[PDB]
Subunit: 321 residues, 3 copies
């Protein structure tokens, strides 16, 4: 009967179209390179006021070289002119009543205890320690540098998909509405401008610059290079997204200590101890490109051939019911 091949032809038309669109949708004919090879060069610009001092890029950006992880210091605590010696720790956790509870068995991971119980102040009595004196008082409140909200982060990114040796940069003058020197990234108006406003990044990440600058934090500028290397070079394009990575028992925020080391004409040494709070920026470059390949195209082919060949049989069985 001729209707049998019009039923079979329809079987193949319909079934083969479902299978066809699915495999064509997932790019099953493409080999994929998910090991992007990226280089990130960052540049911060701006000047702020902290206390009655002005902070420039040499003062608040650390490290200075422009790596993929850098910190913009927004608030700090200074303990000036420390010197090696003996003094009573100011932390309440070091409370003592007598030298019998200032032995090495107490607070093993903390500072070096001399073994004497001394009077830090008239209201507290703490174990004495050997180290930089006086000790740090990290329980005071200090201001934050508000001008940092208007600083700009410039991200030059040069990536390469090695499986295909397809290397490209994220400086694209034609994709940007305004000139490179004056543009400013906006997810909608200018999504390819490499210059980001610090406050903007804080908003795209859903964060309040006040609380964030107060407690410090870790934000991620995510650069995604999802590319179809079957298409034009023009089509491999970076997409920027933003997220807070520290999120959240542990106290949120981000801070670290470093000192400025000075030496007296006498030769004695003394430092300024600095506890820094800021916003660490991690440039996270993901990417995966897909190029047509004979092997995945043959495997996907064989897969779709056999699957339709069985679907037509099963559909014949379902119809005859």
């Amino acid at each position: 009967w001729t209707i049998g091949i019009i039923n079979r032809v329809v079987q193949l038309l319909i079934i083969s179209y479902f299978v066809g669109w699915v495999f064509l949708h997932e790019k099953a004919y493409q080999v994929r390179d998910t090991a992007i090879e990226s280089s990130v060069v960052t540049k911060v610009k701006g000047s702020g006021l902290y206390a009655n001092r002005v902070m420039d890029v040499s003062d608040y950006v650390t490290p200075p070289q422009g790596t993929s992880v850098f910190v913009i210091i927004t608030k700090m605590i200074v303990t000036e002119n420390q010197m090696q010696g003996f003094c009573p720790e100011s932390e309440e956790k070091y409370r003592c009543v007598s030298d019998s509870q200032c032995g090495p068995e107490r607070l093993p991971g903390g500072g070096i205890l001399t073994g004497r119980c001394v009077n830090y102040s008239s209201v507290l009595r703490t174990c004495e320690i050997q180290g930089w004196c006086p000790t740090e008082v990290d329980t005071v409140e200090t201001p934050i540098m508000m001008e940092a909200e208007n600083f700009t982060i410039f991200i030059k990114n040069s990536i390469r998909f090695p499986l295909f040796n397809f290397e490209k940069g994220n400086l694209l003058p034609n994709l940007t509405a305004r000139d490179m020197k004056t543009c400013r990234f906006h997810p909608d108006k200018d999504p390819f401008c490499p210059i980001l406003r610090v406050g903007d990044v804080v908003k795209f990440a859903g964060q309040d610059f006040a609380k964030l600058a107060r407690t410090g934090g870790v934000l991620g500028i995510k650069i995604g290079w999802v590319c179809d290397l079957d298409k034009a070079w023009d089509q491999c394009i970076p997409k920027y997204s933003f997220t807070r990575l520290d999120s959240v028992s542990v106290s949120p925020g981000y801070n670290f200590r470093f000192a400025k080391y000075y030496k007296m004409e006498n030769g004695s040494e003394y430092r300024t101890l600095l506890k820094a709070f800021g916003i660490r920026f991690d440039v996270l470059v993901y990417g995966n490109a897909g190029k047509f390949n004979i092997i995945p195209t043959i495997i996907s082919s064989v897969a779709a051939f056999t699957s339709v060949g069985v679907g037509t049989v099963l559909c014949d069985i379902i119809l005859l019911n």
Copy 2:
């Protein structure tokens, strides 16, 4: 004959079970994301004694920002109050008998030779050089900071599988036996506590803190995120492993030089030159997640269908022999 289909049915039962368990074992129905996207924030805590000085996190940890690669300095060599000028190098490799073997052709990659053969000491005669004087004597023996064994490394890690957009952190309060503030990672008792004892990491890596602190070294804290994103969020879990990466013609260990730069009231410049030996820690985050996908499930399906269809034929041929 009915036995022919009981032989064929057994063929399909047995053969299909082998193929089935194999493919089900390798998760052949799963697409895999092997391009994890991780952020690492580290925090070191502790205080040590070196010579008659106390070292805190601002003194022995470098860099300070808490990156994925940091160094805990255990032994150092100081050459204090250097100043630009001329002086005889102390390295024996620079031995000379006359100014005729102190020309630019000699030791091309070394320091800047003035061209004079001078008497460093009464027992050695070396080429004179222009640079920081006096020169460094890196052949002496110095102590090591033993308290560093009791320092703790706290690793906060926030990763994301971008192919699935599955982001998670390694701070898991319910997986830890004791509180976050006081726990301490143990591969068996508390394998999810993010706080590591430096000495412990040295042991998990099979290293002696004495020799390691003496020569310096490079250890790896490996965080592995092997996950089945078909299962619950609760099941994606990090696993910590440890290894020594410098291992091993070349002299083992790890050291680097940096200076503390001071300026005299006169305006002249002088530095303290420091050769630092310590333990560099590299946090190496690997991860790959697997999620069910239609394409790999169809390809694996077609693969198992055809393979059993041939195995039953071959087994029929083997039986009739």
Copy 3:
């Protein structure tokens, strides 16, 4: 007819050979790990002359720890003995005629403007600013450190393919023609020596050390670990390639600012502001290993079986035409 099976046997011989060589060529029987896990330790050696000063590794290499991204400073601009205060900016872009165009609305991202229009010099009138005074004059010409061309970069690299747990290092004494201590990487004579001459790297990247040292730049030392883990351990070998990553509206080159902070006996603070130009080196380790697997071998098998089975039918149809 017997010729029908000699035509079919030839069909299978020919068709099966094409398919066979193709699949065998692409290692379709291999699972692939493209998430290499690498550790990089670098060491720079050399001494240069800048002005009438000598720069050693502690002076021009930053950071000092030997990370995968480091900088060799070739030219710098010093602005010595700055101090907080008020002074007229030297940038022409800050030209003013009256204090009415020195308000906060002008150059929002720049320095902190006091609101006064002052005379920087007799030929220029600029807005006054609060900050480090005097201001920087980054339009002068300064020398470059030429000895940096003869510096050597030593790269120790320790990688691991985690899917197979195959870890190896790039220190291979038998693959190098000369001893480790004295060899020098050459793409042809000694392509496994880990010691690179800075000038050499500049040439492999197609760059002129003069212009590059003048403007600074970003070069990549690419380490590739393409390996067949079916073969001997001896066969997994690193291959070094080189490229300039900054390439290229934006001014090329690479520079960053950092200060040396001094304090007077009076207690007042003053710094030396340094704009550094150099060559940043990014060690980029790519790698992917292939090991035989049952699943990819079965899938590729099924793929080739079905494809030949159809090719013989299509070829029969083409012949009978």
